[PDB]
Amino acid sequence: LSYAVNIVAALAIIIVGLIIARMISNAVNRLMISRKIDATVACFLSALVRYGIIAFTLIAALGRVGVQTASVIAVLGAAGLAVGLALQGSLSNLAAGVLLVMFRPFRAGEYVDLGGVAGTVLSVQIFSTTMRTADGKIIVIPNGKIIAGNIINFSREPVRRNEFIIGVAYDSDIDQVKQILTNIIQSEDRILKDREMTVRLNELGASSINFVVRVWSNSGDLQNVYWDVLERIKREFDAAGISFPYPQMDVNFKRV
Amino acid sequence: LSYAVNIVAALAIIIVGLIIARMISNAVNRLMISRKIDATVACFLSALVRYGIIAFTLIAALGRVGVQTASVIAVLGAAGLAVGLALQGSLSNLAAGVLLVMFRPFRAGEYVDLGGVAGTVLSVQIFSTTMRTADGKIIVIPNGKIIAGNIINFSREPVRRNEFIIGVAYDSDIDQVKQILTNIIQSEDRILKDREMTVRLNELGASSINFVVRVWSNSGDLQNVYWDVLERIKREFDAAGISFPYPQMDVNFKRV
Amino acid sequence: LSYAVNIVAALAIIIVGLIIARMISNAVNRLMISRKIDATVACFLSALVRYGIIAFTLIAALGRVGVQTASVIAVLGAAGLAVGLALQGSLSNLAAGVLLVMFRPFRAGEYVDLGGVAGTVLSVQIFSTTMRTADGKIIVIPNGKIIAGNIINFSREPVRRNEFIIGVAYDSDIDQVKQILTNIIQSEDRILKDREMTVRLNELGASSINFVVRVWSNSGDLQNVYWDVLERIKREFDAAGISFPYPQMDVNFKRV
Amino acid sequence: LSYAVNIVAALAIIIVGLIIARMISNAVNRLMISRKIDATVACFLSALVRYGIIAFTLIAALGRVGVQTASVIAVLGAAGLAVGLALQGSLSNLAAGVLLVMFRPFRAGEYVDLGGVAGTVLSVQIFSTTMRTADGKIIVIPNGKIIAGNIINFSREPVRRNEFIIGVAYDSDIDQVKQILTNIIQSEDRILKDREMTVRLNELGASSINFVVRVWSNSGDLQNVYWDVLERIKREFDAAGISFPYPQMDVNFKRV
Amino acid sequence: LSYAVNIVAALAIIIVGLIIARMISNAVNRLMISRKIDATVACFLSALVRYGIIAFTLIAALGRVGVQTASVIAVLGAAGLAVGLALQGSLSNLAAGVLLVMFRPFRAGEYVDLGGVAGTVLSVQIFSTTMRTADGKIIVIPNGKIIAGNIINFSREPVRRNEFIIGVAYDSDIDQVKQILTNIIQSEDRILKDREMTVRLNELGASSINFVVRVWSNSGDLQNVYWDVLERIKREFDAAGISFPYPQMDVNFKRV
Amino acid sequence: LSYAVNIVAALAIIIVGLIIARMISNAVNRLMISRKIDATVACFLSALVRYGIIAFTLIAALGRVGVQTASVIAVLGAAGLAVGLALQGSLSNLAAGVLLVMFRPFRAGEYVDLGGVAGTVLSVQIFSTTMRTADGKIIVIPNGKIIAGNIINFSREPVRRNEFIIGVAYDSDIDQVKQILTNIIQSEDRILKDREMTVRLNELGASSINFVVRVWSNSGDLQNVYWDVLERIKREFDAAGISFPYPQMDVNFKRV
Amino acid sequence: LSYAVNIVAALAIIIVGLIIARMISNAVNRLMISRKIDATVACFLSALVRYGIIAFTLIAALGRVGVQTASVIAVLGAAGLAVGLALQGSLSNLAAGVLLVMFRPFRAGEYVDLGGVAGTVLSVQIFSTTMRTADGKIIVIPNGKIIAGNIINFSREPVRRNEFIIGVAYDSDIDQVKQILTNIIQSEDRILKDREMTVRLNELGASSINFVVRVWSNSGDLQNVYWDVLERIKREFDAAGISFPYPQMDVNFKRV
């Protein structure tokens, strides 16, 4: 049984191969990380060399025990394929992960709308991103989904814009409405005066003349500025005699 | 018929091969489980070695009965392919399974929305997850579907937020409304006072002035806090003389 | 024409091959069925060995009539491929079939919603499942579709939950409403008293105060409990002086 | 030019091959049809042998005119591929065809809904099914589309169920309504008395109390039973003093 | 440079090959057309032989100038592939074309609905079908789209069916309505009397009793019959004292 | 280093190959263009010969520097594949381009609806088509999208058809309405009198009798004819005493 | 161990190969950039040569350490494939990037609608485009998505068109309305007089006669022209006695 020496040689090749593979791959992503590339891309690109070299080792090692070479390419091909399928979704998500962290279209702490759902971002991880809805629900979105959809970012821009739509009665003085609104926003300090300040008659409406006011503020102020300006419009308009109309209806009577 | 000895040798290779395969594979996911990896990932990765080694055995075993080698790679290729299709959906679900249990974006007992449907999670199994709708229906969702959709988790966060929208009549005192609402929530112990406590005039409405109240509570209290705070608003508002308006309409008569 | 003996040898191989194939395959799913596996899975896995062995037979048999071996792998490859396409949908449905019968996410006789359509399940067959809509329509759903969609099962859970929403007039006594409702459900024997019994003011509405009542019952009772508790609420509420309001409207007259 | 004899030999192979192919394939689906299988599956499976055998013939025939063998597998591969694409849709429809005729989820003459569209089935053909909409339009649906969508069959079940929803005024006698309705359906012979006979107060409505009546009849009667039972309810309810209410509205006047 | 004679031989093969290819192919779809098959399927199937034979020619011709054979299969493979992609949509449409003309699910001049859009068909061409919308727009729909969607054909059936829904006031005589409607349709000659003639109380409505009338006519008459029968109902109903009701409303006054 | 002469020979083959390739390809689409084919199809088909011939050159040229032949097919295969992906969308659009210009389902200057968006066509280019919305927005639609969607062409047809729907009061004289409408359209010269001229009572409506008028005009006139015929109907109807009704309502009073 | 000299030779080939590759590729996209092509397409096409040449190097280098050649094509094939998947989305986006910058269907600073979302474009980068919504949100859209969807460009056209729809009461003078509107737009300087100036009665409406006015202006003026022309219509119409009607209703009384 002197052809049962090849079995021992087969092992030798595998052990030496596993080690030689483990040490090249380590010694490759040592190189990559020392340049800059990216911790994950390194590990990934690296782990391909690793699994590649032990793929060669398996071919030659089995080959000394008469395993036909072109059957190993085939079996391993299938094996890899079966893995490939089972993972993929993952692989795709893993990649989106990188992109997101290395392009920061949103960063942790920004409020964003990731395709229908919107919340404050917490953390982007391997496959999935975590946000917290204004009200306290947690949403877990797959990195893959995120990257191939629009990213609406509420917070990256430092200055943003409220739009009020105020409806007043048809018999209201057009000039008076404009002046009161203009004088409200003129006096509000939180409204940026060097940017758009639109007060205008915008829509001849169903039962109301509709005025549009649009004014810019720092991103932080936007919410409070809206509320404060509104309370204001309501108060001033009342004290000044301008009516926010209820829904109207001309009824045309007929005794029958 | 001394070339009918290869038939006997063919069998020998298959039995030896089946055993040698069965004992390597066992002895591989013995190794994996002893590290940590994950019970399922082990069995899977393992069962690939297993079916791989008996794939080699079949090639060489048939090969001694003159089965052309490159016809075995082909036939088994097809066989595997036909299986592959039939399973897949499964494979994909099997993998989602792992991910879900080894990332716990939801854990058993959390209430979650898994793409349109929402219920309390019971158990994540091989291919499919089971939840119970608040009202007692059971839903079975495929692990695959779950993992590639958004996961909304109502329960992982410990503190959450009610939003009341209360509509009062236009001639109601703005300051009075704010004070009563503020004094209701101030006194409710279950409302977390160190967090958001927004009471504000939010919308000049169709037939009502609309106030928004937003207050935070422990996740457990959220439901009862809402109900209790509502009953309250209604009672106080009535006793204090503030009117929740019916839908309005100015009618403008015309005899014809 | 002594090279027209190979024609005879070709036949011999086919007949011996067909038989040798027929008896291995039979003798394999004898083994599988005797373990446990699953009648269908056996027949399938078995029928692959069968068609595999006669694939080898065809290669070697044609091969003795100078059919180049690597042209048989090719032709049969195509043949298989053309079948493969034509079937698939089937194969996919066949597999869903198995899964459904060997996981019983619904069993025959349960009422279920299988992605928009809902009915009482009759029987899960090879490719397609049959249900009967409450009203007597028959629906035939492909096993494949069913398995990759949500499965809502109304019947597997033994105890389920009605939710009433009752609207009463704004000037109705909050305490009185709660008491009558509570006293209706308290007295109904079919309502499980050891589970949720929510009677509460839920919504300040358009023209009605809306109370929510939620009470649990056995799955069988759920329908009759609802109807009986409703008739009741209506009767009691009338005799007790509580008004279910018609839609309201404040109209504000103007002679013109 | 003694190597221009191979040209003649090439032809010989083709003619003998075409005939040998035509006669085997005929002689195979003679076999299949005599078992049972199914006329179409026979012709199809058969026509694969046919085109397979002439594929071998083309390889060996061209091969004697120095056409490299592994170039014929390649060219014919492409040719087959180009056909394959162009057909497919057809192949898929052809297969659905079989399935539909050999499972009769609907048969000719049944009224069915095949994914949004519904009509009386006329005939299932090779690729496409023909139905006639109640009003006389003809619809042609592809067999493929049909088989991978839900099949709603109105006609296979012999007994079916009407549901009336009747709204009466709030001040109507609950007991009186139930009795009249019950006495209408009791007396209607076409209503199956040994099955469901639900008359019940179902919904406290907008401006009406809503009663639900559900009664079973033979499939043929269902339409006429509905109409006849309705005319009846209307007549009796009028003569008995029960009011079908118009839409209601409480208006709350304000001189301004 | 006696190995520069192969260059000359290479050309010879190409010219002979191009001709031998051109005259086989012509001589094949001479045969096909003489059977029956179909002009296009002929040209197509033919043009595959053509491009196939010049594929062989290119292999052997380049081969005598030392172009490695298995590099020609590869390059041409790619070339074909690149074409394949660029065309396809076309190929698919081309195939639908054939099917449509050789099954006439609609013929030129029939009015049809081809998945949302409907018009009178003008002409089915290579890739695309042209219809004219009743109002004069021209629509061009791809043959491919048409064939894989439902085909609604308004015109292939010779007799079709109008449905009138007439609403009358609740206090109208049920018997009187039926008689007038029945006497209108009885007298209209264009209504086929040997088919369905349904006049019936169909819906207890919001503010109207709704009668359904359904009557069959020749396809040509359908439009005029509807209009004429309607004018009629309106006239008769008025002269007979039956009221088509305006929308109703019970208003319940409250001085405040 | 006499085996460093092959390096020099490798270059020679590349230069000669690049030139031999460049001059065949030029000399091929010289031939194509001189027939008729189509400038782009020419350039395309041509540029495949070009890249093909330099593919052969690269194989043989590298081959003399011991680059294993079957590694060049592989590397170039991958290279081509990577390009293939990155382009495709383009290739697909490029092809649609051709089709659109060589079938003119719309030509520059026609108003068309290309799947939801509609505008006047400006120019069809390589990948994308440009139209101008009636109001001045520019839309750029990918050729690929266009060709696989419906093409609605408002302009190719020379005569088109307005449809008016006019609602009059129930107590209006049916005959009088028809006559006035008929006499308006009879007198309008721009209405084509040899085509459809439908004036008819079409719908018994909510609060109006609805007449439909449909009349054909040259495509140019259609817009102005509508406006002019409308102004007319309104004027005549008023002077003639026919009332366009406001929405109606029978109110049924109840003191409470 | 004189066969351990091949290890040293393997390295030599790799270093020489890496350098030879790095300097060809540099020296190719030196050439490309010097023509014109496009910085990105250069780098890409170049980087394929680069990775191609080191692919050859790896085959021959490993090959001198007995790595079977046809196993390197296989392993690297897999490696490449795994990368290919992980990237792709990127590759696709990278390509769209190019196209967008090298066709400028929108340029930085134009306001555009990129499939539902619309904003002012900031910058087109490698994979993703950045726009700023009128109100200050930032949106990040993938280049790939953009290119395969419609591109609506508000800004590339220099002159655009407002459409007013003004509703006046039925008893208003048709001629008077036209004249006032016409005289408003006639006098507005910012309205381009050499283009469309449509003032016309457009819709006989529910409770209003609806006039359409359409007038063209420079793209800059469009917004202000609208607002200014509206304020105007409202003022003039009031001073001239034309009434913008409230919603109408004929009510038909019934004492009960």
Cβ burial of G131 (10 Å; 0-12, 13-18, 19+) is: buried
Q: Provide the CB-side half-sphere exposure for D239 (13 A, CA).
A: 8
Helix (H, G, I), strand (E, B), or coil: what is residue B132?
strand
Q: Which residues contact C196 (CB under 8 A, 6 or more apart)?
A: C161, C214, C215, C216
Q: Of C92, C151, C253, which has the smallest distance from its Cβ to B140's Cβ?
A: C151
In eight-state DSSP terms, residue F3 is: G
CA-wise closest residue to D137 among E153, E185, G233, E135: E153
Ranges for all domains in chain A classified under CATH 1.10.287.1260: 3-104
- Residue G176 φ then ψ, to 5°: -65, -45
Structure-determination technique: X-ray
What is the least distance, in Å, from the CA of E228 to any CA of chain D? 19
Output C46-52 pairs: Cβ under 8 A, ≥24 positions apart.
Answer: C48/B79, C48/B82, C48/B83, C49/C21, C49/C24, C49/C25, C50/C21, C50/C22, C50/C24, C50/C25, C52/B75, C52/B76, C52/B78, C52/B79, C52/C21
Do G165 and G211 meet the contact criterion of CB atoms below 8 Å apart?
yes
Q: Which amino acid is at F168?
A: V
| Count of beta carbons in the 10 Å neighbourhood of residue F82 | 20
* Fold category of A105-154 in CATH: SH3 type barrels. (2.30.30)
Beta carbons of G166 and A216 less than 8 Å apart: no
Backbone angles phi, psi at B26, to 5 degrees: -55, -45
Which among D185, D209, D180, D215 has a CA at the least distance from the CA of D197?
A: D215
3-state secondary structure string, B226-251?
HHHHHHHHHHHHHHHCCCCCCCEEEE
D95: which 2 tokens? 């297969």
Counting as contact any 3 or more CB pairs under 8 A, the partners of C are: B, D
Q: Three-state SS for C182? A: helix
D163 contacts in chain C (CB < 8 Å): 135
**Which two three-digit tokens encode residue B221?**
């209290």
Cβ contacts of A129-135, under 8 Å, gap ≥ 24? A129/A100, A132/B157, A134/B161, A135/B160, A135/B161, A135/B163
Q: Work out the angle at residue C34's Cα, subtended by the Cα atoms of residues C32 and C37, and round it to the nearest 5 degrees.
A: 45
- The answer to whether residues C198 and C212 touch, using CB atoms and an 8 Å cutoff, is yes
Token pair belonging to F60: 């043989």
CA angle centred on F32, ends F28 and F33, rounded to 5°: 115
Sign for the pseudo-dihedral over CA of F176, F181, F186, F192? negative
Contact G17, G56 (CB under 8 A): yes
Query: Which pair of structure tokens corresponds to residue D230?
Result: 């309705």
Neighbouring chains of E at 3+ CB pairs within 8 Å? D, F
Query: Considering all CA atoms of chain E, what is the largest pairwise distance in Å, rounded to the nearest integer?
Result: 120
Residue pointed to by tokens 């026609």: F110
Pairing mode of beta strands D151-153, C138-142: antiparallel
CB contact under 8 A, A206 and G247: yes
Identify all chain E residues contacting D144, using CB atoms and an 8 Å cutoff: 148
Phi-psi category of A229—alpha, beta or left, where left has phi over 0 and alpha has psi -120 to 50?
Answer: alpha
Q: Is E215 exposed, middle or buried (0-12, 13-18, 19+ CB in 10 A)?
A: buried
Report whether C9 contacts C64 (CB < 8 A): yes
Query: What are the beta bridge partners of residue E142?
Result: E128
Closest by Cβ to D157, choosing from C62, C82, C138: C138
**Chain G residues lying within 8 Å of A159, measured CB to CB:** 136
State in Å, rounded, how far the first CA of chain C is from the last one.
Answer: 118
**What three-state secondary structure class fits G212?**
strand
Neighbours of chain A (3+ CB pairs under 8 A): B, G
Strand-pairing partners, residue G215, are: G162, G197
Q: Which residue of chain A comes nearest to B78, CA vs CA?
A: A78
Smallest Cβ distance to G150: which of F71, F141, F144?
F141
DSSP label at E5? S
Q: Do D251 and E251 touch (CB under 8 A)?
A: yes
Identify the DSSP state of A190. Answer: T
Q: Distance from first CA to last CA of chain D, Å, rounded?
A: 118
Q: Which two tokens stand for residue E34?
A: 């003489």
Residues of chain C with CATH 2.30.30.60: 105-154
C89 vs D contacts (CB less than 8 Å): 92, 95-96, 147-148
Structural tokens at position G146: 């953009």
Count of C-beta atoms within a 10 Å radius of residue C88:
16
* Helices C174-187 & C222-240 angle (0-180, nearest 10): 140
CB B57 within 8 A of CB A62: no
Q: Is C175 helix (H, G, I), strand (E, B) or coil?
A: helix
The DSSP string of E155-220 is: SSSSEEEEEEEEEE-TTS-HHHHHHHHHHHHHH-TTB-TTS-EEEEEEEE-SSSEEEEEEEEEETT
Long-range contacts of B126-135 (CB under 8 A, 24+ apart): B126/B93, B126/B94, B126/B97, B127/B90, B127/B93, B127/B94, B127/B97, B127/C99, B127/C103, B128/B93, B128/C103, B128/C105, B129/B100, B132/C157, B134/C161, B135/C160, B135/C161, B135/C163
Report the SS3 class of residue B189.
coil
The C-alpha torsion from F180 through F186 and F187 to F188, rounded to 10°, is 110
Token code pair at residue F95: 């092809």
Sign of CA dihedral F4, F7, F10, F16: negative
Residue C59's H or E segment, with its range, is helix C39-63
Q: Crossing angle of helices B89-101/A89-101, nearest 10°?
A: 50
Virtual CA dihedral for E23, E29, E30, E34, nearest 10 degrees?
A: 170
DSSP, collapsed to helix, strand or coil, labels residue E2 as helix
Contact B246 C250 (CB under 8 A): yes
Helices D89-101, D39-63: axis angle to 10 degrees equals 150
CA-based radius of gyration for chain G: 34
Return the amino acid letter for B86: A
CB G100 within 8 A of CB G146: yes
Residue E142 and residue E95: Cα distance in Å, rounded? 11
Helix (H, G, I), strand (E, B) or coil at G167: strand
Judge residue B55's burial from the number of C-beta atoms within 10 Å of its C-beta, 0-12 exposed, 13-18 middle, 19 or more buried: buried
Quick one: which of C173, C182, C169 has its CA closest to C229? C182
Q: Which residue has the tokens 């015109």?
A: E155
For the record, the structure tokens of B79 come out as 């066989």
For the record, the structure tokens of F16 come out as 């000669």
> For residue F17, how many other CB atoms are within 10 A of its CB?
19
Angle (nearest 5°) at CA A134 between A131 and A135 = 110
Q: Please name the residue ranges forming H helices in chain F.
A: 6-35, 39-63, 72-87, 89-101, 143-147, 174-187, 222-240
Instruction: Yes or no: say if G137 and A112 are a contact pair by the CB < 8 Å rule.
Output: no
Q: Taking a C-beta distance cutoff of 8 angstroms, is the pair E203, E177 a contact?
A: no
Q: Tally the C-alpha atoms within 13 A of residue B251's C-alpha that lie toward its C-beta.
A: 21
Residue E245 to residue E168: CA distance in whole angstroms: 6
Cβ separation G231–A201 shorter than 8 A:
yes
Closest CA to D168 of D205, D213, D199: D205
Q: Is the dihedral of CA C32, C35, C37, C38 positive or negative?
A: positive
Please return the burial class of B125, using the count of CB atoms within 10 Å of its CB with bins 0-12, 13-18 and 19+.
middle
The residues that bridge with E112 in the sheet, in sequence order, are: E119, E153
Smallest CA–CA distance, residue C103 to chain B, in Å, is: 10
Instruction: Give me the amino acid identity at A47.
Output: A
Question: SS3 helix, strand, coil % of chain E, rounded to 5?
Answer: 50, 20, 30
Burial class (CB in 10 A: 0-12, 13-18, 19+), B5: exposed
Strand positions, DSSP E, G80-232 = 111-113, 118-124, 128-132, 138-142, 151-153, 159-168, 197-204, 209-218
Confirm if E159 and E117 have CB atoms less than 8 A apart: no
The end-to-end CA distance of chain E, in Å, is: 118
Residue corresponding to tokens 């959390």: B110
User: What is the resolution of the experimental data for this entry, in Å?
Assistant: 4.8
Q: Yes or no: say if B153 and B139 are a contact pair by the CB < 8 Å rule.
A: no
- Count how many Cα atoms sit within 13 Å of the Cα of residue A41 in the half-sphere of its side chain: 14
Closest CA to B116 of C121, A117, G117: A117
CA distance F226 to F220: 11
Domain with CATH 3.30.70.100 in chain A: 155-249
Q: Does domain D3-104 have CATH number 1.10.287.1260?
A: yes
The CATH number of the structural domain formed by F155-249 is 3.30.70.100
Please check whether residue C166 is in contact with residue C229, taking contact to mean a CB–CB distance below 8 angstroms.
no
Spatial distance between the Cα atoms of D109 and A1, rounded to a whole number of angstroms: 77
Facing residue for G163 by CB, picked from F74, F135, F251 = F135
Q: What is the CA radius of gyration of chain C?
A: 34
Q: Are E214 and E161 in contact (CB under 8 A)?
A: yes
CA gyration radius, chain A: 34
